[PDB]
Write a protein that binds this ligand. Structure first.
Ligand code: FES
Ligand code: FES
Ligand code: FES
Ligand code: FES
Ligand code: FES
Ligand code: FES
Ligand code: FE
Ligand code: FE
Ligand code: FE
Ligand code: FE
Ligand code: FE
Ligand code: FE
Lengths: 330, 330, 330, 330, 330, 330
């Protein structure tokens, strides 16, 4: 718990826009979501996506069992109506009395981007941004947002799985493995603008810390751009709700050709990653040199955790200071 | 936790007589029941309903898997037989040896009333009685005992739901909400003989503390008496087993007209009440003036809990001293 | 928790050889097993059955999801290969670097006997042996290994059920209760070589402490030998995986006549034993003279628990010193 | 198919009044029922129970999915309203046009008696009555109507099972088999008023043809009257919906003592009777002298089948002519 | 069967393009579908959508269990490869022998349009076209293809339900009914170009015979165009697979607002339509004047059925001859 | 239908001996089985396995719900006892009366062989014998009888699947397909003693007509003998109960290595074979030269079916006359 408090300062995806619209016949929510073990409710009130604690101030019913009408989220129990700022603006039982100052629920940063809904629980450091997806607003590329997928594994373990190449021959032998490319090198890794940047051989990674990966592939078999954008919502201490968006230049083929392939890859990873125990990586794990990405990831996470304890300035420097290993200029 | 110790001093219903008779083909029980997280067993031993701890003194098997033999409860494992006082009177393997002095299980005050079985776990204060049901022994009324219904909510939250009128428009708009009588005002509430008494003008409540509600309705659409008796068994920290008995003066219609209607009402309340979290109301809940019944209820429970810590005489005064604010003469 | 640590010094069955061979198409395992709440993996590497902690040293994946490859157990994630001593001998991603000294997993004693796989978690006292089954090596007898049966009950409670005669009239009245022979006397019990030995007149028990029972019956209905070997794996604090092997001299009949009878007896015991609570017998249980076997059993277990605290030679003495009550010579 | 047409002339129970009142929240129905493979709908219109073909004349929707509205059954599709004679009296889409003469559905005899709803599909022979239940109107007796029980067996096979004593030692050895009274003799059987009447010494049968059995027991264990009334609804060619009403003079005990016993007896019979094949008894079945009751039953049924072909007065004579074997006077 | 043969001459939708692409990871099919009780397989071979009988010529395995590679559908059993014309072009067991002339399966007209796959089983009359959807290629309108929905009702009964207004007050009271528009008139109906054309008050219907409905609504509440395109696949004698495509001018709102509404309407219709029995409308159904659309629909279907028996010219005239009742010119 | 009458003249396996012993706790049966749509019962009566029609002569209950008593099969309903010839020898209700002459049920030739129970429904031609299994009574071979496996396919289609090599690349590419030995040629096939005999160079088939296959493999990868014996029970027109027995010379490996492999092979075949439709091969199937085994099999079955219509001597010649085309000397 206290060991995860620094994560409240980042933007995390909690649902797709589609999920929010499908939740109830109004198409406006509400939708219950869970983020860092906090129970939240999401709704569209007018033009705004709003996120509140899923707990009415009156008698603690779940607002996610209520109703969106226009610019209000109405509690299902005694009909208190909450506005976009989390403030109750109608107590139907006392329509002429003034509403208690108490009658407000916590309201959090909530924004749509790339077709996902993002929530930032703590905006006090004012230095984190929604992760970078390189294919957004590139009109050469067709974009597909997959349905979210749930794993009984943590966001850290999911991230390390996605950025590891050592596992292809054993988890993905028929699907991703390459006899003639069967142990890619140790590569230089740069920190720039709160992202890890590193390239392989052609795979170009931009990883917005802590849990998002933007992978641009310049493909060998077709010579056309493919982008994978994967981000894990840390739902609680043992669970992730994971999102994949993918973009492609050659878009004459079926979206489901790629969805089925992505789903096959995830199905091969899933049971092995869910088997890792304890859920959080303990100190006794044994790294080797080929674990560079994982080793550097864990080091930066540890530094961000320390810097959060020191405060806004220290956190901003730990996240945003550049640290360059490569020949590249940014 | 220790919050609930004072509740052990009250009589709580644990099952209907019908449930006890259906439990075992003999119609005498035994039946396993749970009350304030205690595992108990109820059986008809001779002319008496008896409650014991559901745990044999010999090797801890559940007596509820056993059988009533004569006027005794026989354990299923090695056949020890327990009398109405929880004392072992036969050890089949050693029929002539003396029975160990410790060969006994705790028993508890247990009585049938109104077709329910009631248990009081702690009788040491000796000032509580079985709640009041006004329709009992009224020849003019047909009485129907419904099957128990289980909620994932506490008895306090269930009580507050049953006595609140604010929620009709939102939970019961098609079934109970009167669009010409939305808000009855604050009414005076009296404490008398360990009951809350209050009237609307016609709904007359007599609420035997802590969890029983007797509601006499002098109906408007029929000019005839209807009585609802609702009481919650606090099974554990997050569960209630709830009992509804209803009585009616005009009794030539179908029982199932009313049962179906009550069931529909409970089905409307249930998911909202079960969503309330945390399960016990914290101090941060925000009341409005329309919540008088709930406010006064919580106040009295707090007083009973503090008086229990001060001992038998303090508790008896907190429970039984009158506090009148209406002009009714009792 | 610490009350059970002394049980780690004994050999416990964890699966049948059949279960191991059925686990994976290779017939070599791996198979996940759980013993005293430890997650272990069993595999056949060459001619050896091996047992390791089910947790890779690299990134903590379960080895039980991996593959046997010759004399090695290969992790499913990045293919680290472990030898019969639990030491990693191949890191495929770094195939010529020195393997970290840390790259080892805990390896436990593991042996086949009687068609079961046995594990001893702690071999430090070097004085325990796999329990004795008298029918092994006897060409006169046909041996049948039943499928394991799981109970929600501890190994101590299961052992006391199997060696008690008092319960027949109440649990097994149609099946084992002899109405003309309804109370076998208290018999002398010998401790010899870490076994309880006692005889009823014809039932000869050799009970390898703590959880195995070898029962030799010279039957009253055939003049033929029948052996029952029952042993309970203590899977965790509330669960047993139980094994029955039986042997018989007159073997021209169907194995399933006997299997169905054993299963019927176990089904009659099961719900009563599973109801016993709390799972471990508290000090408050009330014994009678007929309970001699379980009284003496509990005494010896407590002696073994005390001696374990005192260290290796106290434990050896408590386990293996003779204590003779009968007129028999050993 | 045509072999069963004569059964349409009798009254058959189709549901309990309780089932009808529970079907729909209004307590008035409608309820879908099936009798001799006809799909019917039952409803309470005013003070009358009505039974119609469950098929609207307009577009063939099921009226059982509709609503009772005063003295009318309203179709769910376009709201045509049917009166107690099955005639449409309102076409909402054409509220002042003349209603087509075709706008009528078949209406069948429907009456409540003993707490069951009875239907007679063909009243043309005007000689059948609702079966006789002797305990009705008797203030000395407490009456209990059990929930209906469904069997995969025909009404004839169920009737022959209920009136056979030969099967007790094999189906009911623990439950009804009297080892000292193991073969009741052949008894004289009288036909009187469309009933078989026969007596065993104390068991007095009055069997209203074809499917109802009234059994009056003067018990050997109390000197008290016990009545069993069993009747089978022939739902289709292989299914029965069966009804048991029982009455007892000594009524201070639990209803559920008796219900559980009846249910245990029925559960013992059920799989054997359901196994009988083909469902209707072929001519090749081999009778013995002990089968007198079922031999005479089969003879009378065949007589009724022959007489139905001959028309109304032959059937009346076959049903109601007396045929006396005993010394009794009627 | 013979009574449905005329339907083989029309184009019927059998799946969405999305369903075909999702069926297997190739994204090319194959997909099993059923049309007029014929088992068919659909695949994308190169650029073409192809439909064949789902039955290999060799040993009658289902081609729908096989694999699409490029321009071939490979049988799962012995790998015979079929081309876009249904001809086997590779017998892997006899790669040098010539392929039997027998080695071909029936191939049917198969075309994508509007995002659905359409099949015409009989092209011999050469005068039927894929039904008309007015919103196709109108760039003012956003188009949404719903997931198909299955009903246990025939295409005729589904069509008549969709074009009836009489049922709103009873099936759709809260969702479509209008007190102040509560019985729309009898309207003129034109036959033109194989479509029924009729308008209401503003609802404009173009119904391509036999099973498609294109409804253009000029809405009262928003003054913007909404188009509903509903077509029923006659899967067999009692089943429809139904498709809804809808288009809207005001497309700033959520697609799921409309999907949820359409799904609610269908859920209200579904149980009533599925209750209609027999599945095909028999002669005894009673029409009233307000049934004009249904009456005229059944008349044209009957004429098409007669004309099919007479041949191509007669069928073409029955389908395509104009029959004008309205003031309109086409 | 009448197509299958000739199959009644052959011996078919109906269950394993293990299945019979497991059916009832006595280990003697009875066990219900179905063969060519006949409902039969098998029991061990004394030293004999007996098959009767599963239908009591008295009131048609299933004898398979009864019990073996001594050397008789006792009906569950009224306890009639049937001897090994199907004759009733005890009528409990009339123990002294003469037993009706018709109190008997049909019995059928029934024998154990190889650990299976075989039944021949029609013994009148008296020229068929139980199929040949070459490994029986060979000391060098360990024999494993697998559990039966059920397919929704006919015995003919299952036989043709088992003897076809064409399908390996497509159904079994990972498990059986040899990429260097795809096509063995047409081989000569001999008819001898009612068996098909044919050899590949090493696979030697002896196929006892109609449904049994004995395959002797002189393996290449081990230089040791492996025998597969597969036989299908034609349960009804669309179902088979299939039996696999396998024998091996090198028998120090795990039985479950082989069982798992066989099960994987059957799992690969099963959905393709079950998809073949219609269930019986019609005349429109297209054979190629590689189908010789299947072509010759169907030819011989057609001859047996025609010879059966001509009578006992014609059938005996069709079945037993030799037809040699190899140069082997028998
Ligand atoms: S709990 Fe939300 S309005 Fe009362
Ligand atoms: S545990 Fe109850 S008698 Fe032994
Ligand atoms: S977790 Fe085992 S090899 Fe990496
Ligand atoms: S189908 Fe009943 S009113 Fe139309
Ligand atoms: S059944 Fe299709 S290739 Fe043989
Ligand atoms: S039916 Fe078998 S003994 Fe009566
Ligand atoms: Fe992966
Ligand atoms: Fe309520
Ligand atoms: Fe036991
Ligand atoms: Fe019976
Ligand atoms: Fe509709
Ligand atoms: Fe195969």
């Amino acid at each position: 718990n206290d060991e995860r408090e620094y994560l409240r300062h980042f933007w995390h995806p909690v649902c797709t826009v589609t999920e929010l619209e499908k939740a109830h016949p109004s198409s406006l929510g509400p939708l219950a979501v869970k983020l860092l073990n906090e129970q939240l409710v999401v709704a569209k009130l007018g033009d705004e996506y709003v996120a509140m604690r899923d707990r009415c101030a009156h008698r603690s019913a779940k607002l996610s069992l209520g109703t969106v009408s226009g610019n209000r989220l109405q509690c299902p129990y005694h009909g208190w109506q909450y506005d976009t700022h989390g403030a109750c603006q109608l107590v139907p039982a006392c329509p002429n009395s003034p509403i208690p100052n108490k009658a407000k629920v916590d309201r959090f940063d909530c924004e749509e981007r790339y077709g996902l809904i993002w929530i930032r629980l703590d905006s006090s450091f004012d230095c984190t941004e929604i992760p970078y997806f390189s294919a957004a607003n590139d009109p050469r590329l067709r974009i597909v947002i997959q349905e979210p997928y749930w794993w009984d594994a943590t966001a850290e373990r999911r991230w390390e799985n996605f950025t590891d190449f050592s596992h292809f021959a054993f988890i993905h032998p028929g699907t991703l493995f390459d006899p003639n490319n069967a142990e890619p090198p140790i590569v230089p890794m740069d920190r720039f603008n709160g992202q890890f940047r590193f390239v392989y051989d052609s795979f170009s990674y931009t990883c917005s810390m802590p849990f998002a990966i933007n992978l641009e592939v310049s493909k060998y078999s077709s010579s056309s751009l493919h982008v994978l954008f994967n981000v894990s919502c840390p739902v609680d201490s043992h669970t992730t709700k994971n999102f994949l968006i993918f973009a492609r230049e050659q878009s004459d083929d079926s979206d489901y050709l790629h969805i089925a392939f992505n789903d096959l890859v995830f199905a091969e990873d899933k049971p092995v990653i869910e088997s890792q125990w304890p859920k959080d990586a303990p100190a006794d794990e044994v790294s080797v040199v080929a674990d560079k990405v994982s080793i550097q990831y864990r080091k930066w996470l540890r530094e961000l955790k320390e810097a959060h304890k020191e405060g806004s300035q220290a956190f901003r420097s730990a996240l945003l200071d550049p640290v360059i290993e490569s020949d590249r200029s940014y």
